[PDB]
Design an enzyme around this catalytic site. Structure first.
Site, PDB file in Angstrom:
ATOM      1  N   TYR A  21      46.944  75.386  55.805  1.00  0.00           N
ATOM      2  CA  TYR A  21      46.760  76.248  56.909  1.00  0.00           C
ATOM      3  C   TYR A  21      45.381  76.456  57.517  1.00  0.00           C
ATOM      4  CZ  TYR A  21      51.550  78.207  55.601  1.00  0.00           C
ATOM      5  OH  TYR A  21      52.598  78.416  55.104  1.00  0.00           O
TER       6      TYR A  21
HETATM    7  C1  F43 Z   1      54.404  73.540  51.675  1.00  0.00           C
HETATM    8  C2  F43 Z   1      53.943  74.941  51.487  1.00  0.00           C
HETATM    9  C3  F43 Z   1      52.484  74.872  50.993  1.00  0.00           C
HETATM   10  C4  F43 Z   1      52.207  75.424  52.498  1.00  0.00           C
HETATM   11  O1  F43 Z   1      50.942  75.685  52.763  1.00  0.00           O
HETATM   12  N1  F43 Z   1      53.148  76.259  53.025  1.00  0.00           N
HETATM   13  C5  F43 Z   1      54.460  75.875  52.285  1.00  0.00           C
HETATM   14  C6  F43 Z   1      55.209  75.440  53.574  1.00  0.00           C
HETATM   15  C7  F43 Z   1      55.077  76.266  54.767  1.00  0.00           C
HETATM   16  C8  F43 Z   1      56.208  75.743  55.795  1.00  0.00           C
HETATM   17  C9  F43 Z   1      57.694  75.396  55.260  1.00  0.00           C
HETATM   18  C10 F43 Z   1      58.393  74.646  56.375  1.00  0.00           C
HETATM   19  C11 F43 Z   1      58.984  73.360  56.058  1.00  0.00           C
HETATM   20  O2  F43 Z   1      59.899  73.584  54.835  1.00  0.00           O
HETATM   21  O3  F43 Z   1      58.852  72.282  56.699  1.00  0.00           O
HETATM   22  C12 F43 Z   1      56.184  76.990  56.565  1.00  0.00           C
HETATM   23  C13 F43 Z   1      57.286  77.360  57.500  1.00  0.00           C
HETATM   24  C14 F43 Z   1      54.928  77.120  57.948  1.00  0.00           C
HETATM   25  C15 F43 Z   1      54.994  75.955  58.810  1.00  0.00           C
HETATM   26  N2  F43 Z   1      54.482  74.958  58.566  1.00  0.00           N
HETATM   27  O4  F43 Z   1      55.684  76.177  59.776  1.00  0.00           O
HETATM   28  C16 F43 Z   1      55.857  78.036  55.677  1.00  0.00           C
HETATM   29  N3  F43 Z   1      55.514  77.679  54.473  1.00  0.00           N
HETATM   30 NI1  F43 Z   1      56.015  78.668  52.692  1.00  0.00          NI
HETATM   31  N4  F43 Z   1      57.144  79.947  53.637  1.00  0.00           N
HETATM   32  C17 F43 Z   1      57.686  81.141  52.998  1.00  0.00           C
HETATM   33  C18 F43 Z   1      57.402  81.721  51.792  1.00  0.00           C
HETATM   34  C19 F43 Z   1      56.905  80.803  50.675  1.00  0.00           C
HETATM   35  C20 F43 Z   1      57.407  81.022  49.364  1.00  0.00           C
HETATM   36  C21 F43 Z   1      58.783  80.581  48.986  1.00  0.00           C
HETATM   37  C22 F43 Z   1      59.226  81.072  47.560  1.00  0.00           C
HETATM   38  C23 F43 Z   1      60.583  80.746  47.384  1.00  0.00           C
HETATM   39  O5  F43 Z   1      61.006  81.007  46.069  1.00  0.00           O
HETATM   40  O6  F43 Z   1      61.455  80.068  47.991  1.00  0.00           O
HETATM   41  C24 F43 Z   1      56.339  79.975  48.589  1.00  0.00           C
HETATM   42  C25 F43 Z   1      55.229  80.714  47.969  1.00  0.00           C
HETATM   43  C26 F43 Z   1      55.511  81.616  46.878  1.00  0.00           C
HETATM   44  O7  F43 Z   1      56.071  81.093  45.664  1.00  0.00           O
HETATM   45  O8  F43 Z   1      55.441  83.013  46.725  1.00  0.00           O
HETATM   46  C27 F43 Z   1      56.062  78.974  49.779  1.00  0.00           C
HETATM   47  C28 F43 Z   1      55.442  78.146  49.537  1.00  0.00           C
HETATM   48  C29 F43 Z   1      54.798  76.855  50.572  1.00  0.00           C
HETATM   49  N5  F43 Z   1      55.132  77.240  51.926  1.00  0.00           N
HETATM   50  C30 F43 Z   1      54.647  75.467  50.204  1.00  0.00           C
HETATM   51  C31 F43 Z   1      56.077  74.599  49.805  1.00  0.00           C
HETATM   52  C32 F43 Z   1      56.895  75.315  48.707  1.00  0.00           C
HETATM   53  C33 F43 Z   1      58.098  74.440  48.119  1.00  0.00           C
HETATM   54  O9  F43 Z   1      57.768  73.343  47.942  1.00  0.00           O
HETATM   55  O10 F43 Z   1      59.242  74.944  48.327  1.00  0.00           O
HETATM   56  N6  F43 Z   1      56.389  79.654  50.968  1.00  0.00           N
HETATM   57  C34 F43 Z   1      58.014  82.817  51.769  1.00  0.00           C
HETATM   58  O11 F43 Z   1      57.928  83.598  50.215  1.00  0.00           O
HETATM   59  C35 F43 Z   1      58.941  83.700  52.348  1.00  0.00           C
HETATM   60  C36 F43 Z   1      58.883  83.150  53.777  1.00  0.00           C
HETATM   61  C37 F43 Z   1      58.590  81.717  54.369  1.00  0.00           C
HETATM   62  C38 F43 Z   1      58.132  81.372  55.489  1.00  0.00           C
HETATM   63  C39 F43 Z   1      59.201  81.185  56.563  1.00  0.00           C
HETATM   64  C40 F43 Z   1      59.618  82.341  57.295  1.00  0.00           C
HETATM   65  O12 F43 Z   1      58.944  83.236  57.194  1.00  0.00           O
HETATM   66  O13 F43 Z   1      60.756  82.320  57.729  1.00  0.00           O
HETATM   67  C41 F43 Z   1      57.491  80.023  55.063  1.00  0.00           C
HETATM   68  C42 F43 Z   1      56.266  79.821  55.925  1.00  0.00           C
HETATM   69  C1  TP7 Z   2      41.083  80.157  58.013  1.00  0.00           C
HETATM   70  C2  TP7 Z   2      41.007  79.583  59.305  1.00  0.00           C
HETATM   71  O1  TP7 Z   2      41.020  78.116  59.414  1.00  0.00           O
HETATM   72  P1  TP7 Z   2      39.903  77.384  59.419  1.00  0.00           P
HETATM   73  O2  TP7 Z   2      39.162  77.396  57.943  1.00  0.00           O
HETATM   74  O3  TP7 Z   2      38.721  77.662  60.308  1.00  0.00           O
HETATM   75  O4  TP7 Z   2      40.512  76.023  59.861  1.00  0.00           O
HETATM   76  C3  TP7 Z   2      41.808  80.462  60.472  1.00  0.00           C
HETATM   77  N1  TP7 Z   2      43.137  80.200  60.157  1.00  0.00           N
HETATM   78  C4  TP7 Z   2      43.877  81.270  59.430  1.00  0.00           C
HETATM   79  O5  TP7 Z   2      43.255  82.355  59.181  1.00  0.00           O
HETATM   80  C5  TP7 Z   2      45.323  81.026  59.195  1.00  0.00           C
HETATM   81  C6  TP7 Z   2      45.981  82.285  59.281  1.00  0.00           C
HETATM   82  C7  TP7 Z   2      47.655  82.092  59.497  1.00  0.00           C
HETATM   83  C8  TP7 Z   2      48.154  81.146  58.483  1.00  0.00           C
HETATM   84  C9  TP7 Z   2      48.334  81.546  56.883  1.00  0.00           C
HETATM   85  C10 TP7 Z   2      49.111  82.908  56.967  1.00  0.00           C
HETATM   86  S1  TP7 Z   2      49.426  83.468  55.346  1.00  0.00           S
HETATM   87  C11 TP7 Z   2      41.598  79.995  61.779  1.00  0.00           C
HETATM   88  O6  TP7 Z   2      42.296  78.922  62.239  1.00  0.00           O
HETATM   89  O7  TP7 Z   2      40.808  80.082  62.373  1.00  0.00           O
HETATM   90  O1  COM Z   3      52.503  77.811  49.186  1.00  0.00           O
HETATM   91  S1  COM Z   3      51.436  78.887  49.821  1.00  0.00           S
HETATM   92  O2  COM Z   3      51.323  79.985  49.043  1.00  0.00           O
HETATM   93  O3  COM Z   3      50.124  78.191  49.725  1.00  0.00           O
HETATM   94  C1  COM Z   3      51.769  79.440  51.500  1.00  0.00           C
HETATM   95  C2  COM Z   3      53.217  80.008  51.521  1.00  0.00           C
HETATM   96  S2  COM Z   3      53.744  80.120  53.061  1.00  0.00           S
END
Ligand code: F43
Ligand code: TP7
Ligand code: COM
Ligand code: F43
Ligand code: COM
Ligand code: NA
Lengths: 442, 548, 263, 549, 56
Positions: free
Chosen positions: A366
């Site tokens: 992110y």
């Molecule tokens: C790649 C990441 C690391 C990262 O920076 N973001 C990810 C992925 C990113 C992607 C997943 C999209 C895809 O599958 O292509 C998106 C949708 C953001 C995007 N790029 O659009 C997202 N997560 Ni994440 N992500 C979520 C969440 C979570 C929860 C999932 C826990 C579980 O048991 O399934 C865990 C964090 C945790 O353990 O607390 C999590 C991790 C992770 N999240 C791990 C991948 C985990 C895995 O390998 O399965 N997300 C959530 O806890 C719920 C909401 C959900 C978001 C989508 C939505 O809001 O509809 C999504 C929000």
């Molecule tokens: C940290 C900062 O990113 P940079 O380190 O500046 O690239 C900032 N992003 C965010 O705060 C991402 C927030 C939304 C996605 C994570 C939500 S849990 C931004 O784009 O200005």
């Molecule tokens: O897997 S991370 O917790 O880094 C972000 C979840 S959406």
């Protein structure tokens, strides 16, 4: 003095520097070394003559991958660096007797320009240094080679970049440690804007001098933001003295006794020392035998806690020689410390919270990046009021080469330009000498 | 023959273009206009939806149409349309031009590939790049690739969202899937291809176009972030990484900061906007976005195509809405791309330059700037003096000042190859125009022209800047119509005269050499005309998610 | 001297947490896995291959004196410059024997040179790969691991919060492990990112429900509720209150203020 | 039922017992179990010709979705059950129109302009001249010309959502203004709320300008106060027959763009640069005043829940999920706070606990009271997830669970004490108790603000202390992470709903959205979001009239 | 009150905002101390002095 606290100042080698020093002798408001260090950070400008020359030769103007075909200007700027520097000196100084400093670096390919304090004194903010230096560099180059009027604006663009179409010097060939205030996250954050990799480069990778320089800049920034005012001033001074400056050798001894240890064993050593020194005391013993502690001196407890925090960073990152672990260490040091004792952790939760986001933004898609690019003006790592970023400086000194955005990649010329400044490179010993100069005036 | 006469003859049918007199007050007011009649009719049909709130009413204020209300020929086309069809709110092509720029970002791939090889021990090959490009074309429009129980974006509303790759390394280009390749050797004439590749080198870039609906619902600052999020997901998926480890933060920093090329830079607080908004697009950046340079070797035509797109971008949309709003600034802008008027003046100047100096035949000197700017300004003024219908067409002084000075500035750039000599010539033209007609533009038109000669070749702080890199935030330029579009032409002019492949950035130029854009950037005139005719199909509409 | 406390609480759950964290508490081994099979499930290298470096040997980075740096002993993987690699677990909320913050606190007490990340759905350690493999062996052989409720998984981790399947195993969308109905054992058929294994790795028999209630570190009302651990709650509230007081400052720093006011 | 969420759980899981710990997986056919996924896949294939070979959405790329059951969601307080994809802001026209209605609104005081007319220009202002001015601006604001010859104009059919209205605290003047363009405080608000609003507004008059939806979609939020001001100036010139460009006209401009303007959102710092009227600049109390539940319900839990639903769409789905990130985004981080009546159950439990033990508004804020309420409501919330396996499989991500439990705890604390900062302090207690109970909390970087939270909740320092109602997405601790801002908007609303206040931070904002002619229904964001999820919501700003049939 | 902050504070600050920030911090604490403002009202004093910072 105002406060009753006195400390012994110990160097980065763990040997005594100054005995029985009033706490205020290391205040950013009193210490003459801190004042000179902050003045030098504000007034110093790095001029990249080799970059100006190459930008002009290719018309590579105004930033990343820009070229303007047909507008190339071919000038021997580096070969005439001495003449050009002498002209910059004449244009930047306010008198022959003032504190203007011009130093050629790296066979004339760069210049360190330190703008006289007289110019800073009649300017509103610190951008004057870059602006005045840029104007002098442009005119010096134009005069040196009698650059014609239709080519002159390319010289201007090579030096200052895309300004004023951009709000800053995008793609410029000069740089400052402090970026312009229009890019500050928070009011008063100017001094917090130095990335950890630059700190490491300025101190030539020496762990405790890097963490000291970071602590000095961070805590001095806390005076600028008004955070270290009134009730909170002593907390920030004690934080500087203990965590930044190895007061009473506590930082050093914590690392030394835990060199084969873990974050947990560092916590145990710190809690034990805090009990011996009567900084904390038992508030209540619970059914299980668990003792819940309370601070006897809240600002001093926070300082002891922050010192253990830096020591835990050095032990755990030092064990891995890989800086990525720094955010995790800051997080779980505070977490374990709180559940070990019932006490509030460093900065009453804010160092731990900073580490949570820092962990996430150094392991996720992110934003953020590797640990070396963070600083106190970054949205991720701004939240702790000076107690977290010194850990990142220490961590990147200890990285043995695991980062893509390494010191060499982000900060490759920062050592050659700034690290010969003694107070920058070796802040602990020089702040102690400043403390000795004023200790009897407090 | 003068190039504008064909339009005058159609616009003033039944009247001699040289006659100084006419009849007025005899057209029925607004009822003379198809478009005004349509507008009034929709206003009445809106009464029920509005539940009583008054609305558009031609009887409020000025009784439009006491003179004859003009049609306009879009220059270089045979399309004749009422001015209202060129208003950016009414013209989907203009809106899609802006959206296609706002929604594009360019990201280098070499740093991510180094992270994979050097930090993660993962090998990068043509086959793995190809697989990654397939993944990001599912992820970028909103498809999930790692997590269970993801909701996704409806593909039907984001069919304009895609990613492509280009490289200066011909050996790698021969190995990349052509479905996702912007092929420099196929899009550009041989010499331009060679020039682009010498500047790009053995570097590889992906061009991400996020969905049009996204930049409409949100803003330009969304684009680099959206691109970077899905680049990260696509590396994780394609290269089978741990989905959340320290190296991933390196892809992020690269994609949002260290290796990203945005279209526009941020604004200061008074006119605050994030990146990829129109005020942040430098004039030379816009000239590189427009693609006329690679399909035409007529430097006048190339400059004129840039001016047309830039008039839509900077005067109609940026100054006319973002910075003001309302009825706005349609005709301040259309004066620079209708009726072949600017064409006539610029082709005169180019032919004068060809005869006296040669194209690129002079070094920049004040003598040459004075000679060319004066001559083209006099010629331009004389056209308004010889044709009363021309002067009734460009009825606002600002329009006339911009068009004469555009021809003067571009022609000066054609001769000298120097954009700042061009813009110095523009400032000479303005003060000569003023002294000839004892008028110039609107109340605040010549703020930048009176400061312009001194700042054109200045080297100071916020004054000096090579002209290609100036833009809508250059301080003198930050407020007023009738300059920014033409300055984009002046940025393009020395490069078109030289036959350069680009003005400021070869990555920008290649990034828009792509038939799969929605707006046709090879001819902004033709696309805007198609919008004026209600024949342009934009992106980002919501028909699939709303009732029939 | 100082006797570490590790965590507050009067219930069996609290004592289990303390047992995990206490480095002098010997974790019971419940199963054995060969070095080869652990390396295969990790999925980063093949056994017998030289460990791969990310930088030269450490002694080529330390030519200048840094007294504080040399106070700290590097782990063997840092000495050799070995690359950093990872293991990651999901732990079922149905009384998996280890749980995410429990793991983080355990690792930071017991192990050296740790980078550990805690999330609701998974818990990661990234470490120099040489030393990671020793740590990982302990994390899979001991009571910190139950093959039914502790899933090894580097991607697509969903399942910690889901109902168990009809064989009592945690959900895994990639099915990196399967229940062998002939034996009752849980068998890994893929490595932690989901590539197929040439040779399946038997992880043995799931713990029974009652053993999990006894050794787990999560509070659940149908086992031991958080509400019943009045001591643990009291300390959490004390941490919260102290943080509130420190942030407000004016009372806890009253004597510091009084000195600043000259009173 | 025993719990407000049980009805939804039983429908979502096909009659499965909510209390049973076991189930079957891998038996749904993957993505083919979902009508919506099948639709998406078929559109992706039909897109092949338009894309000319560029690959596109392909369910066989990456994760094989649907190894578990893909849930439908009940929008809370409605009977609408929709697949999660129908709540994605890109797919949901109601969510997009909510944001656009906010972005496209600005409020401008009229008293200064009227003083320029009388005092500088010698022109009298009467109810009749105000009414004529309001008629003129409703022609000018959508792009109709009023002064110059040969003006082109905006097609009225594209901008039928653009209009201007007036409101005043002066009842005597309101009786004289044209009803067609009046927002009538005494008709829109219950008597006690009307009286409160008028006491704060006084004898002042304001116009509410809603610039066209197509303008903010084509441009941005920073366009709005400018567009408004341009046409305010044109309408004074025309309605009062002024010289069309004289010195006094600049006073109208400065009043309309700076001295007398009320914007919805303030600017961002450079790292996250945006102009005004973008979501990051909307303070939590500002958003609670935009939502209109307060004026049609006297149930403080209901009022807070409607605010949270609207704020989850604005801050988590749109702001954090697109403006600040993008991609698949954050639909379900947000929907956890407005679906399946789950948050409702926890918050109704907390309100009833408060009613029994303290009384609503029955206690001064004390740490004893915050600790009592937050602890009890957090324990109750956690116990719900432990008692119902299908509940825990619904809120499958820790962040979701943490946000919903802490929201109930924080709002309930605000109900008892009337103090929003006591509320948010309670929210931070709830988070660290939640973490110690389950040995987990949210995503990797979820609790940055929660570990800093107790110390900064009652802080008085620089960038730390700030009354909670005025915090927003740019408050430094809050600037990055999902699962907090939507719930903070509820906590901002909660003490004012418990007090029966007519507004939380700004009475002009509250009146400015009490208007049936908005496109999104701000009295119930839940209802409107549901209508969009059903593809029954007709948004503004589409371009059908100017594009080929 | 006209408050002129000491040059010593300006000397070790990067820009001139220090004077407002320090003065704001001093005013907030002076008021809270003068009247022993309780912890739940104190943030309103802060907001009265420095406005909507840091949301703005
Ligand atoms: C790649 C990441 C690391 C990262 O920076 N973001 C990810 C992925 C990113 C992607 C997943 C999209 C895809 O599958 O292509 C998106 C949708 C953001 C995007 N790029 O659009 C997202 N997560 Ni994440 N992500 C979520 C969440 C979570 C929860 C999932 C826990 C579980 O048991 O399934 C865990 C964090 C945790 O353990 O607390 C999590 C991790 C992770 N999240 C791990 C991948 C985990 C895995 O390998 O399965 N997300 C959530 O806890 C719920 C909401 C959900 C978001 C989508 C939505 O809001 O509809 C999504 C929000
Ligand atoms: C940290 C900062 O990113 P940079 O380190 O500046 O690239 C900032 N992003 C965010 O705060 C991402 C927030 C939304 C996605 C994570 C939500 S849990 C931004 O784009 O200005
Ligand atoms: O897997 S991370 O917790 O880094 C972000 C979840 S959406
Ligand atoms: C009220 C102002 C003062 C001001 O701040 N802006 C005005 C009006 C503003 C309005 C007029 C719309 C309407 O009639 O309702 C708009 C469209 C901006 C808006 N609010 O949307 C506009 N002008 Ni003006 N304005 C223009 C121009 C001009 C020219 C018109 C000269 C002539 O002889 O007709 C003169 C300045 C000059 O003398 O040079 C001018 C003045 C003026 N301009 C005088 C009105 C003059 C009059 O009473 O007739 N504009 C132009 O020169 C051409 C482009 C034209 C703009 C609309 C378009 O671009 O399509 C419009 C641009
Ligand atoms: O009349 S003015 O020149 O003030 C504005 C013209 S659009
Ligand atoms: Na129990």
């Amino acid at each position: 003095p105002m406060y009753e606290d006195r400390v012994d100042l110990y160097g980065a080698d763990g040997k005594l520097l100054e005995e029985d020093v009033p706490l205020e002798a290391v205040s950013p408001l009193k210490n003459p070394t801190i004042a000179n260090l902050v003045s030098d950070v504000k007034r110093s400008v790095a001029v990249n003559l080799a970059g100006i020359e190459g930008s002009l030769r290719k018309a590579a103007l105004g930033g990343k991958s820009n070229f303007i075909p047909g507008r190339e200007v071919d000038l021997p700027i580096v070969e005439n660096a001495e003449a050009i520097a002498e002209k910059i000196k004449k244009l930047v100084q306010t008198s022959e007797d003032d504190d203007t400093n011009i130093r050629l670096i790296n066979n004339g390919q760069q210049i360190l320009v330190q703008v006289p304090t007289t110019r800073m004194g009649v300017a509103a903010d610190y951008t004057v240094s870059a602006l005045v230096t840029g104007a002098a560099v442009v005119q010096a180059i134009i005069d040196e080679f009698d650059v014609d009027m239709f080519d002159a604006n390319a010289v201007k663009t090579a030096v200052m970049g895309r300004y004023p179409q951009t709000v800053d010097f995008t793609g410029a060939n000069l740089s400052t440690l402090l970026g312009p205030p229009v890019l500050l996250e928070g009011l008063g954050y100017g001094l917090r804007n130095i990335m950890a990799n630059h700190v490491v480069a300025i101190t030539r990778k020496n762990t405790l001098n890097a963490s000291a320089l970071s602590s000095i800049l961070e805590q001095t920034a806390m005076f600028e933001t008004g955070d270290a005012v009134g009730a909170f001033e002593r907390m920030h001074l004690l934080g500087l003295a203990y965590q930044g400056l190895n007061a009473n050798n506590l930082l050093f001894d914590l690392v030394k006794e835990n060199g084969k240890g873990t974050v947990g064993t560092v916590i145990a050593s710190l809690v034990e020392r805090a009990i011996e020194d009567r900084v904390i005391k038992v508030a209540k013993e619970m059914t299980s035998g668990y003792k819940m502690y309370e601070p006897a001196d809240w600002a001093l407890w926070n300082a002891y806690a922050a010192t253990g925090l830096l020591a835990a960073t050095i032990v755990n990152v030092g064990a891995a020689r890989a800086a990525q672990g720094v955010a995790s260490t800051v997080l779980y040091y505070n977490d374990i410390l709180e559940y070990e004792t019932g006490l509030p952790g460093v900065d009453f939760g804010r160092a731990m919270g900073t580490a949570v986001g820092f962990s996430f933004f150094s392991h996720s898609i992110y934003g953020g990046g590797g640990p070396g690019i963070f600083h106190g003006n970054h949205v991720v790592t701004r939240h702790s009021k000076g107690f977290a970023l010194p850990c990142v400086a220490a961590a990147m000194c200890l990285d043995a080469g695991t980062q893509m955005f390494s010191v060499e990649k982000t900060s490759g010329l920062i050592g050659s330009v700034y690290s010969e400044i003694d107070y920058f490179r070796e802040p602990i010993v020089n702040v102690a000498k400043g403390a000795a100069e004023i200790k009897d005036q407090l | 023959k003068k190039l504008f006469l064909k339009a005058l003859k159609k616009k003033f049918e039944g009247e001699d273009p040289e006659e100084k007199s006419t009849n007025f007050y005899c057209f029925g007011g607004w009822e003379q206009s198809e478009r005004k009649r349509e507008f009034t009719e929709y206003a009445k049909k809106a009464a029920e939806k509005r539940g009583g709130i008054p609305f558009y009413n031609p009887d409020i204020g000025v009784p439009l149409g006491q003179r004859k209300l003009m049609a306009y020929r879009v220059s270089g086309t045979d399309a004749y349309v009422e001015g209202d069809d060129l208003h950016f709110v009414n013209n989907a092509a203009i809106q899609q031009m802006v959206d296609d720029i706002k929604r594009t970002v360019i990201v280098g791939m070499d740093t991510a590939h180094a992270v994979l090889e050097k930090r993660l021990g993962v090998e990068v090959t043509p086959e793995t790049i190809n697989e990654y490009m397939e993944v990001i074309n599912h992820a970028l429009p909103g498809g999930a690739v790692v997590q269970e129980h993801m909701v996704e974006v409806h593909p039907g509303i984001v069919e304009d969202c895609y990613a492509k790759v280009f490289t200066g390394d011909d050996n790698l280009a021969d190995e990349l899937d052509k479905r996702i390749l912007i092929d420099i050797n196929k899009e550009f004439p041989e010499e331009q291809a060679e020039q682009l590749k010498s500047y790009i080198g053995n570097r590889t870039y992906q061009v991400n176009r996020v969905p049009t609906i996204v930049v409409r619902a949100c803003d330009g600052g969304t684009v680099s972030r959206w691109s970077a999020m899905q680049i990260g997901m696509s590396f994780i998926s394609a290269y089978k990484l741990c989905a959340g480890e320290a190296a991933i933060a390196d892809f992020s920093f690269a994609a949002k900061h260290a290796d990203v090329i945005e279209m526009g830079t941020i604004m200061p607080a008074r006119r605050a906007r994030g990146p990829n908004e129109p005020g942040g697009v430098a004039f030379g950046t816009f000239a590189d976005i427009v693609q006329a340079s690679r399909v035409s070797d007529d430097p006048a035509n190339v400059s004129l195509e840039v001016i047309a797109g830039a008039a839509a971008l900077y005067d109609q949309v940026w100054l006319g809405s973002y910075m003001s709003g309302g009825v706005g600034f349609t005709q301040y802008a259309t004066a620079a791309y209708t009726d072949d008027i600017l064409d006539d003046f610029l082709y005169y100047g180019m032919e004068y330059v060809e005869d006296k100096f040669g194209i690129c035949g002079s070094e920049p000197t004040m003598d040459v700037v004075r000679d060319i700017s004066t001559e083209v300004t006099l010629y331009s003024l004389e056209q308004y003096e010889e044709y009363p219908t021309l002067l009734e067409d460009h009825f606002g002084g600002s329009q006339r000042a911009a068009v004469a000075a555009a021809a003067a500035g571009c022609s000066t750039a054609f001769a000298t190859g120097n954009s700042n000599a061009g813009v110095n010539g523009w400032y000479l033209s303005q003060i000569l125009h003023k002294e000839a007609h004892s008028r110039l533009g609107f109340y605040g038109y010549d703020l930048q022209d009176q400061c312009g000669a001194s700042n054109s070749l200045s080297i100071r702080s916020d004054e000096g800047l090579i002209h290609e890199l100036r833009g809508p935030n250059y301080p003198n330029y930050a407020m007023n119509v009738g300059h920014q579009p033409e300055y984009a032409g002046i940025a393009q002019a020395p490069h078109a005269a030289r036959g350069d492949a680009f003005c400021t950035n070869p990555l920008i130029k290649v990034a828009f050499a792509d038939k799969d854009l929605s707006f046709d950037f090879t001819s902004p005139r033709k696309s805007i005309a198609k919008g004026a005719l209600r024949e342009f199909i934009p992106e980002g509409e919501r028909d699939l998610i709303i009732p029939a | 001297s100082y006797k570490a406390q590790y965590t507050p609480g009067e219930t069996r759950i609290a004592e289990n947490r303390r047992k995990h964290m206490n480095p002098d508490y010997e974790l019971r081994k419940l199963r054995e896995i060969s070095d080869e099979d652990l390396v295969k499930v990790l999925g980063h290298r093949n056994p017998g291959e030289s460990y791969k470096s990310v930088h030269p040997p450490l002694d080529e980075m330390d030519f200048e004196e840094d007294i504080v740096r040399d106070l700290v002993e590097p782990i063997q993987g840092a000495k050799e410059g070995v690359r950093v690699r990872y293991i990651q677990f999901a732990d079922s909320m149905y009384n998996a024997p280890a749980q995410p913050y429990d793991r983080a606190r355990t690792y930071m007490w017991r192990y050296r040179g740790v980078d550990t990340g805690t999330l609701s759905g998974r818990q990661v350690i990234e470490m120099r790969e040489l030393d990671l493999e020793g740590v990982s062996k302990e994390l899979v052989e001991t009571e910190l691991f139950d093959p039914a409720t502790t899933g090894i998984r580097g991607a697509t981790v969903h399942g910690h919060s889901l109902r168990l399947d009809e064989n009592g195993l945690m959900f895994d969308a990639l099915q990196r492990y399967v229940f062998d109905e002939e034996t009752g054992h849980v068998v890994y058929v893929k490595e932690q990112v989901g590539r197929p294994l040439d040779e399946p790795v038997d992880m043995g028999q799931p713990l029974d429900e009652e053993e999990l209630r006894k050794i787990t570190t999560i509070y659940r009302k149908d086992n031991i509720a958080m509400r019943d651990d009045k001591e643990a709650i009291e300390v959490v509230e004390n941490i919260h209150t102290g943080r509130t007081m420190g942030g407000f400052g004016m009372d806890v720093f009253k004597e510091d203020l009084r000195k600043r006011l000259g009173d």
